[PDB]
């Protein structure tokens, strides 16, 4: 008997209520407040140029057809009431394939205050496009966007605003980072306008600024490349009579550099330019190849000009270690400054 | 002023027969299509397909939906699209496709006072196209999207590109990492099946592959191994273990690259333009090891002739390979 009071209120509100018409149709612009709570910033995929994010996506607007007076100022109702009234048709402009979770029930809430204000939040897993400029890979940073607005209503009908000051209208949970090789420095919150073949629409934008962590690639690629270059220059110290021994040094290091060069683009998308890692491998290849060319020079002059052959070997013991050291000073200083 | 809109809309749907097309049993209904391409990605040779996201719009007049007294274009909730007649357009070469549904179904219905309906959907589709890889990786591809009506023939429906050559937009903003759209084209025609003749609209792109990736990954590793095998001609011919180790390693490595490259491609039965290079590079490193075997077999009885062969190979082998590069890179470009 006690809930029959709220049964009458809910039945009264929906009596003659048309959910096909936006609030204030033909009279004013429907203003929708929005904020996002990021529960977990998911992994970033360099191969697909995308990223995943889990959000509590909250929306709020005023509908005067849903004003009531009764025992409670706020009705915390079931989420199936959302399908009975008008809700904004918000979509993500750069979204790829998102999920509106409904386990064990549709993860939505709907709260109606006595003045008609509606609060309507839902839990989503958004997978959004994030184009990347991989010229400075693996020392690169990216600004991954997240844009959303109405799908059918132009800015003369529905507009979106941030609930609070824009910097504080997107909040990231402290423990939610699901990032492996990236670091979330911060996010910037903005608002735009798009003009399509159907009209002008308001777009709400967020940019997440991610900087990649180079630690994995130092172990996986840079350290093997450096040790291969050093390993090939050990051949300069073997005596000139070890022709089979110095050849095996030369060939096995060259073969190794080819394997490392091929294996270093497995994760990356197929791009037509050279990254910062491709320049390191190419130069390290030049040092390994030039150490074998030096041996063929020393081996060519043996038994004919022994004095010159010793001269070449003595200088290579200094020039090769010094040049490779200077190259690393220039390489790391050039890219770690940015 | 708002209860009048509800009264007007409820009057239209009252008695509305969704089972009947506009002008049923009369002149064909004309439907105009606009496409607003959002992104193209996942151009795969393994699966012989590509993925396309677009804003797909259809435009037609239904006299049963004409209203008066409201000087507005009624933009209704997308759930009203389940009560009106819409064309049964499908994509013939479509393997997988979905309409995005976050936060609601990405769908737009917008009526006009004269009865015109604008119906827009945001569609991601994985269309199919067969790629001729005989010139891979220096090849061009032509991947299309076919648009057709399933049930209604040309006696019932007509398709035209709304806006002529400007019907499809958004192509110039696409940046595929591995390709580049040379040109897009729009075609209108009729297709005859056993059950009748149906209209069709075809949208086609011409993609030209970028070779910059394959220089680093495939061509340069092959060229450097071939140069590596010419060091053997500057080593003394009595150093057998040294020159055999150099000759053997290059030959087996050259085989390894070719096998590795074929892993990530469809099991096509023809020879691609990259295989002719790898097979051509294999012959040079195989003739380099085959050359030493002749010197080693002959340098005992005729040591003078063995020295000459090593000195002539230092010129012929670099010259022949560069001549091979000249013929290869001029036939395929």
């Amino acid at each position, epitope marked *: 008997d006690n809930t029959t009071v709220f049964t009458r209120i809910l039945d009264r509100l929906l009596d003659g209520y048309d959910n096909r018409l936006r609030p204030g149709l033909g009279e004013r612009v429907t203003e929708v407040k929005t904020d996002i709570f990021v529960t977990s910033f998911g992994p970033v995929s360099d191969h697909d140029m995308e990223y995943t994010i889990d959000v509590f996506f909250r929306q709020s607007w005023k509908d005067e057809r849903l004003k009531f007076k009764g025992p409670m100022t706020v009705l915390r109702l079931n989420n199936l009431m959302a399908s009975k009234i008008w809700t904004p048709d918000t979509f993500f*402009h*750069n979204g790829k394939k998102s999920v509106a979770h409904n386990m064990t029930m549709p993860n939505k809430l709907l709260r109606i205050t006595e003045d008609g204000t509606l609060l309507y939040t839902m839990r989503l897993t958004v997978r959004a496009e994030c*184009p990347m*400029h991989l010229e400075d890979f693996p020392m690169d*940073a*990216h*600004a991954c*966007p997240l*844009k959303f607005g109405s799908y059918a209503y132009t800015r003369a009908e529905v507009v979106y605003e941030w609930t609070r000051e824009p910097a504080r209208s997107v909040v990231v949970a402290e423990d939610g980072s699901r990032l492996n090789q990236y670091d979330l*420095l*911060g996010q*910037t919150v*903005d*608002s*735009g*306008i*798009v*003009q*399509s073949s159907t009209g002008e629409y308001v*777009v709400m*934008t967020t*940019h997440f*600024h991610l900087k990649r962590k180079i630690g994995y690639f130092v172990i996986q690629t840079y350290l093997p490349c450096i040790m291969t270059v050093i390993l090939s220059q050990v051949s300069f110290w073997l005596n000139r009579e070890s022709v089979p021994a110095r050849t095996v040094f030369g060939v096995t290091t060259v073969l190794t550099m080819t394997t490392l060069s091929i294996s270093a683009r497995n994760s990356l998308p197929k791009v037509a330019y050279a990254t910062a890692m491709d320049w390191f491998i190419a130069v390290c290849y030049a040092f390994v190849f030039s150490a074998l060319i030096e041996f063929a020079t020393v081996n060519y002059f043996t038994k004919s000009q022994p004095a010159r052959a010793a001269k070449i070997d003595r200088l290579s013991r200094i020039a090769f270690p010094l040049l490779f050291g200077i190259f690393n000073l220039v390489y790391w200083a050039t890219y770690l400054n940015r | 002023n708002m209860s009048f809109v509800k009264e007007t809309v409820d009057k239209l749907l009252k008695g509305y027969d969704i089972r009947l097309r506009p002008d049923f049993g009369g002149p064909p209904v004309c439907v105009g299509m606009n496409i607003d391409i959002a992104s193209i990605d996942m151009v795969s040779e393994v699966n012989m397909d590509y993925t396309l996201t677009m804003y797909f719009q259809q435009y037609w007049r239904d006299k049963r939906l004409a209203y008066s007294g409201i000087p507005l274009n009624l933009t209704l909730d997308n759930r009203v699209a389940d009560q009106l007649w819409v064309p049964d357009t499908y994509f013939l070469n479509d393997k997988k496709s979905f309409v995005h549904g976050v936060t609601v179904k990405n769908r737009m219905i917008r009526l006009h006072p004269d009865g015109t309906v604008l119906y827009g959907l945001r569609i991601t589709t994985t269309a199919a196209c067969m790629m001729d890889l005989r010139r891979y990786p220096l090849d061009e591809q032509n991947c299309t999207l076919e648009i057709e009506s399933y049930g209604y023939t040309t006696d019932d429906i007509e398709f035209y590109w709304r806006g002529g050559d400007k019907a499809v937009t958004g192509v*110039e*903003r*696409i*940046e595929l990492p591995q390709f580049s759209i040379v040109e897009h084209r729009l075609v209108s025609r009729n297709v005859v099946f056993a059950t009748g003749a149906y209209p069709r609209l075809s949208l086609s792109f011409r993609l030209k592959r970028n070779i910059g990736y394959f220089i680093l990954q495939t061509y340069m590793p092959s060229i450097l191994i071939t140069i590596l095998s010419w060091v053997s001609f500057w080593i003394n011919y009595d150093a057998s273990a040294a020159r055999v180790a150099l000759g053997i390693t290059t030959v087996l490595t050259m085989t390894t690259i070719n096998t590795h490259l074929r892993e990530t491609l469809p099991k096509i039965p023809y020879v691609k333009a990259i295989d002719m290079y790898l097979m051509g590079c294999f012959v040079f490193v195989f003739l380099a090891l085959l050359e030493y075997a002749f010197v080693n077999y002959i340098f005992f009885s005729q040591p003078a002739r063995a020295a000459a062969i090593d000195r002539w190979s230092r010129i012929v082998f670099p010259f022949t390979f560069s001549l091979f590069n000249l013929v290869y890179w001029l036939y395929y470009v």
Partner: nanobody
Framework: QVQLQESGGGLVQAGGSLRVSCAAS????????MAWFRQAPGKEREFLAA???????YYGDSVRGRFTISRDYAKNSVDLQLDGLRPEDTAVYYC?????????????????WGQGTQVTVSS
């Protein structure tokens, strides 16, 4: 080399359209953000308008509703349309392009800059 060259501009009298155009060469900027900045003499370099690959338009508050930014992706150009100009709008206008790291409204996030065009409003 990558250069942003800016044409248009000039002198106008108390309002009136003055379209300013920027031509980019040496690199395809389809995936970048091309913006417009203004620097009045001695005040600061100020953000005016930007547009990214998805045709989204961003404007500064002082110029929102007056200046319209457009991009021509086939020609790798961005054009800004100045309307209702005022003597306060007399400055040098700069063309920029970047990836918008730490904010599309910050001049430190654009790695490519033009040389500027003089726009003088006489009234």
């Amino acid at each position: 080399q990558v250069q942003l060259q800016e044409s248009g501009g000039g002198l106008v009298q108390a309002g009136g359209s003055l379209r300013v155009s920027c031509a980019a060469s040496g690199r395809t900027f389809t995936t970048y953000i091309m913006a417009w900045f203004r620097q009045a003499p001695g005040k600061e370099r100020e953000f005016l308008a930007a547009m990214d690959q998805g045709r989204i338009q961003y404007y500064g508050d002082s110029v929102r509703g007056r200046f319209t930014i457009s991009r021509d992706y086939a020609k790798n150009s961005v054009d800004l349309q100045l309307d209702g100009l005022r003597p306060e709008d007399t400055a040098v206008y700069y063309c920029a392009a970047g990836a918008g790291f730490w904010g599309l409204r910050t001049a430190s996030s654009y790695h490519y800059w033009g040389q500027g065009t003089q726009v003088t409003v006489s009234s």
